[PDB]
C-alpha cells in the first residue's frame, strides 16, 4: 500500500446529480474493487500458509 | 454637530396667511438631513417634514418647504387657529449628534412608548429612568433621549445605534448612562451627577430603521415616533 | 455551531479566531446552526469548500479599511438579526455604504496584489424586499454592477422580489466571491446595491487537507 | 407571481422564454420591443431578456 495525505469527500448541489451520481459510483467502485482483491488476498494467502506449514513438515 | 438659527423664535399671523420659517446653520448641510415638528404646550410633539421637501403621513398639504445646504426653509400655505404651536428643526449629524433649533411659535391672531420615574431627586444625586415599548420590534430602530425646558430651546441630551456606538453632548457625557433591551422591549437611563440643568421635560424618542427588517416600514434619517415625556427636577 | 458563512464573514456569534493562521482540518456538524443572519444565496459553496479544503498559509487582513476608503458614502448601517448578545451589528469583514444624506454617488474602485501571495475577496449584491429601500437609500431603480478581473468578471442589474419572511427577512443579500492571484487586479464598479470588502483573506494554497462534519 | 410548497414533497417546475422570428408578433402581442423576465428562488434565480433571431 502506499496511502496519500489524503481528504476523502465531496458535497455537491442538486444541479450537478451528474458529478454526484457519477463520485458515488466512481467511489463505490473503487471500494468494492479493494475489498474483492483484498479477500481474495486473505483467502489465498491463508490457504498458502497451510499449505507452506503442511509443505515444512512433510 | 452645528449650531442652528431658527427664524423667528416666536411670530404673530391672521388667518388665510402663509408662514415662511427658516432653519440655517453654520455649514453646508444637505439636506435629507433635516426633520420638521408642531407641539402644543401639554401635547408631546408630533411629525410633519422631513428633508426640506418632503411630507409625512395624517396629513393636509398646506406645509411645504425647501431650501438647501445651508439655509433650510419650511413655508406654510394656509394658517389657522388650531395650528397655534410652537414648531422644532431637528437634525442628525454626521457626527451622530442631533442638533435643535429653539422652536418657533405661531401665534393665530384674531404603536406607543411609555416612560417610567420622573420625579424629584436631591441635586448632586442619582436617579434612573426606564422607558419601555408596545406594538413594534424595540431591534430595529435608533434610540434617542431628548430634553426640554419649560418654554426653552431644547437640548438633545443622548442616542444611541443598536450597533453600540453611542453619541452624548460632551458636558452631559460621564453623568448620564444609557442601555438597552430588545428581548424586554424597554430602555434603561441610569444618571447620576445631576444639578439644576437637568431640570427639565424629558422625552423618550424611537429614530431610525438601521438597515434591514421585514416590514411595510419605510425609512426617514428623521424620527419615527415620539414618547409623551416626563418632569424631572433636583431640588432641597 | 457556526457555519462555514458565520466563519468566513465575521458573524459576531462565530468567533472570528485570527490567531488561527493554519491547521490539520475543518470541524463541523452535519447541520450548522448558524447560518446568514439575513438570508441571501451563496454561490459555488461548494467550490469555495473545495478551495477551503487545505491551508498552507491563511490570514485576514484589511483591504480597504472602513475608515477613509468610503466617504462619500455612510458606511455605518448594520441590521438587528446580525446580533451580539441580543444587540445589533453585521459581519466584520463586510461593509454596507448608502448615501450622504440620500445622496449616492456611484463608484469605481479597484485593487491589485503587493502581498505576491493569493488573495481570496468576497463581496455581495442587494436584492431588497420593497422599492422604497431602493429609491430611498441608493436613488436609482436600476442597478448595474460591474466586478471585474482578468480571468473572473461578472456584472448584476437586480429588481424587488418579495421573498417570504426568514428570520424575520423578507430582503436578500446573494452573495459572491473569488480567488485573486499575484499580479492580478480587481476592479468593482457600481450604481449600488453591494456589499463592499472591509477585510479580506491573505493566503497560500493548502494540500490535501479537508473537512468533517461531525458531533463527537 | 409567486408559489411555495404546502405539499411538504418536492417539486419540479418549466417555464419558457419567448424568442420570435419577428418584430411584429413582440410588438403586438406583448407590446414591448424590451423583453425583461425574471425567475426568482432562494437557491436559483436568473433573468431573461431576448430579442428577435431570425
Ligand atoms: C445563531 O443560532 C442561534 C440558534 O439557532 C440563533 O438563535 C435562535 O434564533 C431563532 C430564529 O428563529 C430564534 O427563534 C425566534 O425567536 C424570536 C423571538 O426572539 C421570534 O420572533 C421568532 O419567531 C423565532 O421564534 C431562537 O429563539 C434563537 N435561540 C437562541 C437560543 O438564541 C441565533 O439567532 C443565531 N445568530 C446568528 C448571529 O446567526
Ligand atoms: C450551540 O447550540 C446549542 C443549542 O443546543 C446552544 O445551547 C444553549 O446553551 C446556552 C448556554 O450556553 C443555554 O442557555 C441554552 O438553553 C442552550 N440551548 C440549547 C437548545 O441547548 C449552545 O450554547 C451553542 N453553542 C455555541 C458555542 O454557539
Ligand atoms: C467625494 O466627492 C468629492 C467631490 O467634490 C471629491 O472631492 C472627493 O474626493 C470624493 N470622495 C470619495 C471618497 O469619492
Ligand atoms: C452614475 O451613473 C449614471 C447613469 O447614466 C451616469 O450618468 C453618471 O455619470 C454616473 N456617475 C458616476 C460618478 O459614475
Redesign the interface.
Given at each position: 500500500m502506499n496511502t496519500?495525505?489524503?481528504?476523502?469527500?465531496?458535497?455537491?448541489?442538486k444541479?450537478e446529480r451528474r458529478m454526484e451520481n457519477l463520485n458515488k459510483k466512481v467511489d463505490d467502485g473503487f471500494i468494492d474493487i479493494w475489498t474483492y482483491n483484498a479477500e481474495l488476498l486473505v483467502l489465498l494467502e491463508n490457504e498458502r500458509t497451510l499449505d507452506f506449514h503442511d509443505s515444512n513438515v512433510k | 454637530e452645528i449650531v442652528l438659527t431658527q427664524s423667528p423664535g416666536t411670530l404673530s399671523l391672521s388667518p388665510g396667511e402663509r408662514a415662511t420659517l427658516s432653519c440655517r446653520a453654520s455649514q453646508s448641510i444637505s439636506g435629507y438631513y433635516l426633520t420638521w415638528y408642531q407641539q402644543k404646550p401639554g401635547q408631546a410633539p408630533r411629525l410633519l417634514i422631513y428633508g426640506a421637501s418632503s411630507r409625512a403621513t395624517g396629513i393636509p398639504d398646506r406645509f411645504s418647504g425647501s431650501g438647501s445646504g445651508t439655509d433650510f426653509t419650511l413655508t406654510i400655505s394656509r394658517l389657522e387657529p388650531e395650528d397655534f404651536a410652537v414648531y422644532y428643526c431637528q437634525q442628525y449629524g454626521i457626527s451622530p449628534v442631533i442638533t435643535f433649533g429653539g422652536g418657533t411659535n405661531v401665534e393665530i391672531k384674531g404603536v406607543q412608548l411609555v416612560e417610567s420615574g420622573g420625579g424629584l431627586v436631591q441635586p448632586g444625586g442619582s436617579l434612573r429612568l426606564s422607558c419601555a415599548a408596545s406594538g413594534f420590534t424595540f431591534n430595529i430602530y435608533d434610540m434617542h433621549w431628548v430634553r426640554q425646558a419649560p418654554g426653552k430651546g431644547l437640548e438633545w441630551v443622548s442616542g444611541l445605534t443598536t450597533g453600540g456606538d453611542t453619541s452624548y453632548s460632551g458636558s452631559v457625557r460621564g453623568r448620564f448612562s444609557i442601555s438597552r433591551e430588545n428581548a424586554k422591549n424597554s430602555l434603561y437611563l441610569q444618571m447620576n451627577n445631576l444639578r439644576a440643568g437637568d431640570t427639565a421635560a424629558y422625552f423618550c424618542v424611537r429614530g431610525v430603521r438601521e438597515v434591514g427588517a421585514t416590514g411595510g416600514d419605510p425609512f426617514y434619517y428623521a424620527m419615527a415616533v415620539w414618547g409623551q415625556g416626563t418632569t424631572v427636577t433636583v431640588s432641597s | 455551531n457556526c457555519s462555514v458563512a458565520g466563519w468566513i464573514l465575521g458573524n459576531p456569534e462565530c468567533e472570528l479566531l485570527i490567531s488561527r493562521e493554519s491547521w490539520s482540518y475543518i470541524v463541523e456538524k452535519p447541520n450548522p446552526e448558524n447560518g446568514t443572519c439575513y438570508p441571501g444565496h451563496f454561490a459555488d459553496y461548494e467550490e469555495l469548500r473545495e478551495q477551503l479544503s487545505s491551508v498552507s498559509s491563511f490570514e485576514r487582513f484589511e483591504i480597504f479599511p472602513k475608515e477613509s476608503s468610503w466617504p462619500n458614502h455612510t458606511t455605518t448601517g448594520v441590521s438587528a438579526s446580525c446580533s451580539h448578545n441580543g444587540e445589533s451589528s453585521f459581519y466584520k469583514n463586510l461593509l454596507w455604504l448608502t448615501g450622504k444624506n440620500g445622496l449616492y454617488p456611484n463608484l469605481s474602485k479597484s485593487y491589485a496584489n503587493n502581498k505576491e501571495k493569493e488573495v481570496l475577496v468576497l463581496w455581495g449584491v442587494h436584492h431588497p424586499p420593497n422599492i422604497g429601500d431602493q429609491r430611498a437609500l441608493y436613488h436609482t431603480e436600476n442597478a448595474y454592477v460591474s466586478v471585474v478581473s482578468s480571468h473572473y468578471s461578472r456584472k448584476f442589474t437586480p429588481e424587488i422580489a418579495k421573498r417570504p419572511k426568514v428570520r424575520d427577512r423578507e430582503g436578500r443579500i446573494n452573495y459572491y466571491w473569488t480567488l485573486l492571484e499575484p499580479g492580478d487586479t480587481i476592479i468593482f464598479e457600481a450604481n449600488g446595491n453591494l456589499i463592499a470588502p472591509r477585510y479580506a483573506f491573505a493566503l497560500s494554497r493548502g494540500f490535501g487537507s479537508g473537512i468533517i462534519n461531525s458531533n463527537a
Open positions: 496519500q495525505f489524503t481528504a476523502v469527500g465531496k458535497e455537491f448541489n444541479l | - | -
